[PDB]
Design a protein around this nucleic acid. Sequence first.
RNA 1: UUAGC
Length: 1264
Amino acid sequence: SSMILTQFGPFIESISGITDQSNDVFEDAAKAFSMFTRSDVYKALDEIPFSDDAMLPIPPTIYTKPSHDSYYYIDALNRVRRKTYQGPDDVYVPNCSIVELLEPHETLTSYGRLSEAIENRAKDGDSQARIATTYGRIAESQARQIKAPLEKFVLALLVAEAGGSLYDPVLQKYDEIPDLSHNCPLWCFREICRHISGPLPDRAPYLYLSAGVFWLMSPRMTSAIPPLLSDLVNLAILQQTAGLDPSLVKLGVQICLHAAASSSYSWFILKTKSIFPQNTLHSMYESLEGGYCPNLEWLEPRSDYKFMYMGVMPLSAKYARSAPSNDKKARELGEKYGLSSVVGELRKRTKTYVKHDFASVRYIRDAMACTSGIFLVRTPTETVLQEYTQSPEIKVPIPQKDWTGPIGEIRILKDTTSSIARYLYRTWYLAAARMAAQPRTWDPLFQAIMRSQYVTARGGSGAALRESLYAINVSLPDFKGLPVKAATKIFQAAQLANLPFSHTSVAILADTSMGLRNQVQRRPRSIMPLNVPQQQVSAPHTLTADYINYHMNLSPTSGSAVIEKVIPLGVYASSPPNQSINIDISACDASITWDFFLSVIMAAIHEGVASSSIGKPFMGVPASIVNDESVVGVRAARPISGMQNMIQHLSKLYKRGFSYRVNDSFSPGNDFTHMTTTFPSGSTATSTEHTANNSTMMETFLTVWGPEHTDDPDVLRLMKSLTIQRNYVCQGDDGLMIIDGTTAGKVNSETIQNDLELISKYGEEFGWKYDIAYDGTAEYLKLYFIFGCRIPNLSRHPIVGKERANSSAEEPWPAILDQIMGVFFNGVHDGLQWQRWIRYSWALCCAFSRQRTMIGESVGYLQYPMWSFVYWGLPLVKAFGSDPWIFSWYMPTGDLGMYSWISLIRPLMTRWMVANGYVTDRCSTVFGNADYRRCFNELKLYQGYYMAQLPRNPKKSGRAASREVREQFTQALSDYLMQNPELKSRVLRGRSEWEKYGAGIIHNPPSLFDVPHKWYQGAQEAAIATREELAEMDETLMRARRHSYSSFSKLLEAYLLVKWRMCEAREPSVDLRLPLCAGIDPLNSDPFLKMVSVGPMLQSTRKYFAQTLFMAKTVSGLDVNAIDSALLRLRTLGADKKALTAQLLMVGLQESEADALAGKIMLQDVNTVQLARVVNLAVPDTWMSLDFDSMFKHHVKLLPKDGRHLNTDIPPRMGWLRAILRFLGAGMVMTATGVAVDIYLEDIHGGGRSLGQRFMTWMRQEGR
RNA sequence: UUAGC
Ligand SMILES: Nc1ccn([C@@H]2O[C@H](COP(=O)(O)OP(=O)(O)OP(=O)(O)O)C[C@H]2O)c(=O)n1
Ligand SMILES: Nc1ccn([C@@H]2O[C@H](COP(=O)(O)OP(=O)(O)OP(=O)(O)O)C[C@H]2O)c(=O)n1
Ligand SMILES: O=C1C=CN([C@@H]2O[C@H](COP(=O)(O)OP(=O)(O)OP(=O)(O)O)C[C@H]2O)C(O)N1
Ligand SMILES: [Mn+2]
Ligand SMILES: [Mn+2]
């Protein structure tokens, strides 16, 4: 550690709260990090006096592995396959030797890559060579699933941990987290690596590079070492920053060692990933004596996902685990995988917790953080053959007699059918009719928005489309000479812009390209990049599904992302007397096939949509005629609408299946097209479609099936008490059944179990394998809840990991910083020990803030000041002579954040600046007689501030584009969007109207006429950058570092004029014994105190924020938030109604709606959040889990504590000021360590009025 | 070649 101490001494003290932080020391540390060689990090590890408790037997078979060759074979289709040994799953990367297949590297003689000789043979067609190349490429792919070299994270840990224990400012004592000499993952990392390197000077087992991965030429290396080491590093960092229990952490290391000890690390990890969750979370409190759980009320309507805290629910044996015992299966799993030692220890401990409190949930959390975080990996061929193969077993098919004759591609399900499909058909028919009935549906703008949804800078199987079109002799414009990426649906859109649906129809059956995705703790999933016509024709399906989810069920739309994964719902459902069954449907995509669902859904939509869509085109699709054979004998022609024409074509594809074109770049020679009937993921229907069937079937069960299959009075009573509208929330294939409790306690466990067995039996009838889980836990959207307490899953957030499906190289330097920030933010959301985490983040950042640059022997260096990370969101540990750890990680981001920390120590700064020569005769309004301009330029505070706001990736704009083809393109884009003249006429109106009432007021008019340009811009930036464009990026950042400044942004200079007075701490908003988020307990002072004083956000953030916009959606390409800002800004700037009416016309609205909303906006009392946008203020993400709405409303007094001040009074017409003022107050409160405090407006330098003009100046100057 | 939200 003397190696580390000597080289980072001063820096360590700065991020440990002992010494102030200075950019001079930060940048040096950066340079030290950059000069540390990989073997040096191991040399440093050697200096650690590890304790015996940090050691455990390392399996000798982790080193000696068999040849890879016996693990593969060539199949009947000549594709290189993984040869199974431990079951159908044994398809991942096998644990084998690999040195024998490498050629030493030219320079790094001790490291090696796959022999070029072997690849050439493989490329020639040699079976043995292909087998070896595949194994080589896949094993390499496995090692790449990390963000940067493991040594960088380790070195950072060493530097951060050299600071020793950290003193808690609030608790007033040092933490008792064991030092590194007790870190078992680290000890293993050093020992395993040292054992591999052996006599070799090079200490690294492998090198994560750009030229690819290279392996240390040791006969002890294994394809499993990269993943294993990656797991140990995460655990190493977490034991120190999450304050994890070392004893548990070892159980986690043991499993990993066993994974490396197995024949396939990846596979073993997958089969045992449930060990920690099963032996703790799903086995808590078989005995219960005390503790408290939340007591929440679900507000009406339940669809708002809004709850209110009502106190605490004392716990007793009355609430002990009533759900079935998983002991037997749990021990069986351990026995089968040689981990019964771990399982047992886990069970024995889980039993000692008889009180539900901070101690026990932290235990669960702790346990669940020890699960491997590797992104499982296997060759594309293997994913495709395992995912697009299995078919649903429809145990009770729809009788063939129950279909009518064909109506084109569809057959109506007779209304005499006795099949359960009867109900599935009614629901889709109803929704389809009502949706097509809505007037909006027929509005040109709406159809433009829909058509735009899939016009993105993402792929759409471009090539395949082109050829399916060539098959019918129809060539698409190639726009030869344009600097944009051709494999984008944006490019596709332009090619198809001027072609009749009849000419592009065939493309609906074109092949699908391969798209892959690796996930932590899950198998890789294949994806289908549908093409523009395929996406277009799918609208009907998507729209009807949306109608169901918005009007007929209780569902959440999103992918996820904490808090908007509706944390509140989880607290409620998991809180006694409430109970929840976690429903899931396995192989959902393979379960939605034509045979039962799609054939029915297609028919119901086609029929229910008939009367309202009649005689009309839809989204560019014409109406037509199709053969009609419904009635026996009677065979005629039927006039169908364009919307129906869509279902007609979509039905053709769903029926045939998808032609998945598989070009496995990891497996030489594995090129094949695989036909599959599994549902598409890349469809705009997918998510919403599955969410819809989910609720529909569950509704059918609870209403029909269930009741009809049991005469059990209790099961019938329970069932009758459940409605999909109140008690069943779902998203995609995930379901959460919430059984509200009574005063008599919770519903009988045995009755619930009966109910569930009926649900299971029910699914088999139509090919669905329900994955039901009744264990006293709530698990929805990968969020874990117990007794009202959320349990973050640290293992699903690998600190070092990163999905990398493709072979392409990582993004150029800068890019990594964003990733490091995201790592920080997860730690804040996951609840790690705030100080330990903040200090480590500083070490990690500093270790990635410097990069070597080239300009032609012009060897320089790009260095980000420490101040750039603050701007990005990382709080200061201690600056300007202030006390240590006064800043919380809830410090806002950007300007709002800069204003907050600076305001919290304004005087300190001034006093310090002066005391250090930074004095002047000019008295600064914010910094008194401090020479703040000369100070910030020297410390690189301005420099860093501006560097933070510059692009972290190369820009392609500026590429020479021949004006003519450039115009043809943007023209094509335009025609695609301006298909319907009515829309265009609308925008034109807004335009001439704008020149009269709005032009001049603001300069950011969002216009549909911008879309073509924004779209082109996107297709451009999607293409690969050039080494030159990379140089231009560095030059920009490097120029901003040279330049000197005299001020901050115009807005931040305005906020600084506002001074406050922090006062009395807020009273608790929730009980202090109440466990709300494991890890967030009295042991994690700042997060914990914030949670308690501020209170938890008890509503769905998506519902909440949906109430801060006048318009929810708009043509993809425009910004809903921009439009909302433009309108409020025009209002705030005194613009006339007609001006807002003009703005709305310009983004597609009908004059009537335009005038209506315009007139509505004018007279509205805009809420804080919504209004705060006029000046680009946004609720910080880190705040999302807290009750910020209440902080704004009741704890940020705008009336000075001692009455009214001339400067503080808010001008008559400047009421909007109050919204902006609330953010500034909140900013300071949230940034200060400890309890939320009530803050009071103390002063506004030039008065409110002056401030308003200052803001309005900014407003009217935006985009000049 | 590398999807929808
Ligand atoms: N002032 C410097 C010099 C080097 N490096 C880092 O060094 C790495 C590769 O170059 P080296 O060969 O390691 O640098 P040298 O300066 O030549 O080595 P030292 O003086 O011991 O000789 C990458 C580069 O960012 C750095 O950050 N700052
Ligand atoms: N923004 C960037 C990123 C990389 N490079 C160039 O790429 C070359 C090597 O790539 P890296 O692997 O990214 O640089 P290293 O110094 O070898 O180490 P790493 O980025 O961790 O620092 C040398 C460097 O000049 C550059 O000029 N500008
Ligand atoms: O990036 C993503 C991630 C999930 N998606 C959808 O959600 C579901 C299923 O969710 P999950 O449980 O994660 O996938 P399964 O195949 O059902 O995993 P398994 O049976 O172990 O549960 C299938 C997809 O349609 C999606 O479309 N895109
Ligand atoms: Mn599933
Ligand atoms: Mn799922």
